[PDB]
Amino acid sequence: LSPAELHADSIVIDGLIIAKWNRELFEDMRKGGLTAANCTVSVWEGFQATVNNITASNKLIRDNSDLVIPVRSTADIRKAKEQGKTGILYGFQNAHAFEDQIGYVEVFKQLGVGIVQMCYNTQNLVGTGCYERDGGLSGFGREIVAEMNRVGIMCDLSHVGSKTSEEVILESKKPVCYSHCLPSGLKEHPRNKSDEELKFIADHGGFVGVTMFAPFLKKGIDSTIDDYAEAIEYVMNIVGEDAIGIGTDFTQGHGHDFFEWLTHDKGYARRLTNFGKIVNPLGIRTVGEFPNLTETLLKRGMPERVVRKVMGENWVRVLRDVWGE
Amino acid sequence: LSPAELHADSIVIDGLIIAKWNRELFEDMRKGGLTAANCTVSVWEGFQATVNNITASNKLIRDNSDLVIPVRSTADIRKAKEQGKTGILYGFQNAHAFEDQIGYVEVFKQLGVGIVQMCYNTQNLVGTGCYERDGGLSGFGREIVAEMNRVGIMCDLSHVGSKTSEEVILESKKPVCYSHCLPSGLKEHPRNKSDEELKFIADHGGFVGVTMFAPFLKKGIDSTIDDYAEAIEYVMNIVGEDAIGIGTDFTQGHGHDFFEWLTHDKGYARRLTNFGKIVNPLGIRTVGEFPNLTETLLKRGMPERVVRKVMGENWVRVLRDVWGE
């Protein structure tokens, strides 16, 4: 009932987190009662470099198994909750890790990867990102989507351009998602999505995780926990209460080198953009503050049942759909 | 001079050979009076692997140095004519070997690569090739072209397809070429270029070597060395006598797997096309019959100085310009 007992008695999931990994990050996940999270282990990296991140990841988990456990099935999510731990679901923010092999889709799946973004800002072998002329979904890309549907890896399009994004929604036989994005109806920015877009992905059984990245918020570095709920309500107004969730996009622990890496093509080439100061909305600057989002949305008019949805239940339902598991 | 004396006294150069390497291939090159030839060492492979192709090539050059030598500058071309050997010019048919490192461009030039094709049939990191909806040249591609221009690696667009192709011609500050293509005015086909595309490339200081791959010829597997001259004459009629050359798509020695490799995306995925029965036009079916090409053109009426140009002079000139030497 009380905004604390609810968060506690609930499945909380985060669609996207790219924080510096260490035991302290893990403990802050626990402090926030986080049940599970899509953790990025690749963005610009190729096959082997991505594999390395996974090896490094499996080690941190292994060494901190009293705080976190791997996530391959939604059953792992139920386990994590009933065990007082945080489930970790491996994700890629780029299909580039597959390189030119369609066989790697099954390989990574076998290594615990459950969500893969099609592209990242610029042109891929499969499609093209959101910061450049979008050429659409390539032939090779349609083969990658297909195998991903067969193997059980969800298609993510947060950083993919509109042309290729639409083709992917129309091609996959399993729900796709925008793990972390914001409405352009509040802020123009190249990474935000239009109302037409948000309505189009929901109509096709899609899912949408609303993010809180300062740069993409209407008020930016002056945004508050409430400005986030505002955006979450704007999206739910188009998407509906069954296709909306959370995708904070927490970059907790990272520094200067990390952001410059995210803003230059390939992590080192030409400048694609400039985010500016990185200031999360006041009221939810750290993972350990996740519970303020349950209390907020709650004290904002949204009934308990819908809240359970937005905080995690919805993420579980789609992941269950896509993994058959 | 009789066509025999002429061919022998001429600098004959093949814009593109991609046959099975061994001591028998060389020797046949010598029989043909071949001065220098653009030899492909990459088409579907990435950085390392292409490098392996290169160390294996260097091995052959070294073990058969009485017949061949490396060609890095137009001076190396003259050196071959002086020593009666065939200079080998390492070339790529896909920029995929650069992967996502603009620094690899210089790396390969230092290893001998002097001519590179931007894409091969399908989407790249830099563009798209004929055979699929062409999105154009990307930001990463624009950077690659700029570096290629600086380091001295000529841009090839035979398998690139109009759009990224045209954009490359405008972006590049050095002449670019269609090492091996045929006029679509004689045979409609995705690999063939139009009269507008051929005039365009020439009007921009570009170069065009004509090929004789059966599938692209009007008469197909029924063509003859004359049908080849007809194409050369067709192209020279637009391009002029200074922007045309030879780029016989010699595949001497290769078997069945090789062609299936050339016809499926990434070398194994979806079939992009089907060449059919591979038969070279009668009277020029082996690199050892090169002198018949000179004889023919001459027999058809092309004056001596022009024949010398089509056979090799034009190539050396554009390579001289593009390499700064």
Distance from CA of B285 to the nearest CA of A (A): 34
Question: Do A140 and B265 make contact, defined as CB atoms within 8 angstroms?
Answer: yes
Phi and psi angles of residue A154, each rounded to the nearest 5 degrees, phi first: -70, 140
Residue at B153: amino acid letter: I
d(CA B122, CA B161): 9
Contact predicate B108/B127, CB 8 Å: no
d(CA B291, CA B141): 39
- Partner A contacted by B49 (CB < 8 A): no
Experimental determination approach used? X-ray
Buried b (16+ CB within 10 A) or exposed e, A237-274: ebbeebbbbbbbbbbbbeeeeeeeebbbbbeebeebee
For residue B135, the chain A residue with the least C-alpha distance is A135
For residue A138, the chain B residue with the least C-alpha distance is B123
- Partner A contacted by B261 (CB < 8 A): no
Contacts of A102 in chain B (CB under 8 A): 269
Q: Which of A46, A102, A138 sits opposite B122 (nearest CB)?
A: A138
Question: Do B140 and A266 make contact, defined as CB atoms within 8 angstroms?
Answer: yes
Q: Where are the domains of chain B?
A: 1-325
Angle between helices B195-203 and B164-171 (to 10 degrees): 10
Probe site for chain B from A120, A124, A138 (most B CB atoms < 10 A): A138
Question: Do B270 and A99 make contact, defined as CB atoms within 8 angstroms?
Answer: no
In the numeric block, the tokens 């063939």 are attached to B192
d(CA A249, CA A18): 7
CATH code assigned to B1-325: 3.20.20.140
Contact predicate A206/A262, CB 8 Å: no
Contacts of A261 in chain B (CB under 8 A): none
d(CA A314, CA A316): 5
In the numeric block, the tokens 């050359």 are attached to B245
Distance from CA of B8 to the nearest CA of A (A): 45
Contact predicate B177/B15, CB 8 Å: yes
d(CA B257, CA A97): 27
d(CA A298, CA A83): 26
Sequence-ordered alpha helix ranges (H) in chain B = 3-9, 28-31, 47-63, 74-83, 103-110, 139-151, 164-171, 195-203, 225-239, 256-263, 291-299, 304-308, 314-323
Angle between helices A162-171 and A139-151 (to 10 degrees): 50
Question: Residue B190 class from Cβ within 10 Å (0-12 exposed, 13-18 middle, 19+ buried)?
Answer: middle
**DSSP state at residue B269:** S
Other CB atoms closer than 10 Å to residue B269's CB: what's the count?
16
Question: Do A269 and B143 make contact, defined as CB atoms within 8 angstroms?
Answer: yes
For residue A265, the chain B residue with the least C-alpha distance is B140
Residue at B9: amino acid letter: D
Question: Do A140 and B102 make contact, defined as CB atoms within 8 angstroms?
Answer: no
Contact predicate A77/A53, CB 8 Å: no
Q: How many CA atoms lie within 13 A of A293 on its CB side?
A: 35
Cα dihedral A105, A111, A115, A120 in deg (nearest 10): -70
Distance from CA of B92 to the nearest CA of A (A): 18
In the numeric block, the tokens 């269950």 are attached to A320
- What's the gap between Cα B132 and its chain centre? 21
d(CA B106, CA B98): 10
d(CA B109, CA B99): 15
Sequence-ordered alpha helix ranges (H) in B33-160 = 47-63, 74-83, 103-110, 139-151
d(CA A254, CA A257): 8
- Partner B contacted by A75 (CB < 8 A): no
Sequence-ordered alpha helix ranges (H) in chain A = 5-8, 23-31, 47-63, 74-81, 104-110, 139-151, 162-171, 195-203, 225-239, 256-263, 291-298, 304-308, 314-323
d(CA B314, CA B35): 14
- Partner A contacted by B102 (CB < 8 A): yes
d(CA A310, CA A15): 11
Question: Residue A86 class from Cβ within 10 Å (0-12 exposed, 13-18 middle, 19+ buried)?
Answer: buried
Tokens describing residue A318: 């789609």
Q: Which of B96, B135, B270 sits opposite A135 (nearest CB)?
A: B135
Distance from CA of B127 to the nearest CA of A (A): 9
Q: Which of B101, B132, B136 sits opposite A138 (nearest CB)?
A: B132
- What's the gap between Cα B202 and its chain centre? 16
Contacts of B135 in chain A (CB under 8 A): 123, 128, 133-136, 138
Tokens describing residue A175: 């729900």
Rg (CA), chain B: 18
Cα dihedral A203, A247, A130, B124 in deg (nearest 10): -100
Q: Nearest to residue B208, comparing CAs of B75, B62, B309, B106?
A: B309
**DSSP state at residue A255:** -
Contacts of A44 in chain B (CB under 8 A): 100
Distance from CA of A89 to the nearest CA of B (A): 27
d(CA A168, CA A155): 8
Residue contacts between A and B (CB atoms, under 8 Å): 73
Contacts of B102 in chain A (CB under 8 A): 269
d(CA A315, CA A178): 12
Q: Which of A101, A135, A270 sits opposite B128 (nearest CB)?
A: A135
Tokens describing residue B104: 């690899």
Q: Nearest to residue B225, comparing CAs of B212, B239, B234, B238?
A: B212
Question: Do B122 and A139 make contact, defined as CB atoms within 8 angstroms?
Answer: yes
- Partner A contacted by B140 (CB < 8 A): yes
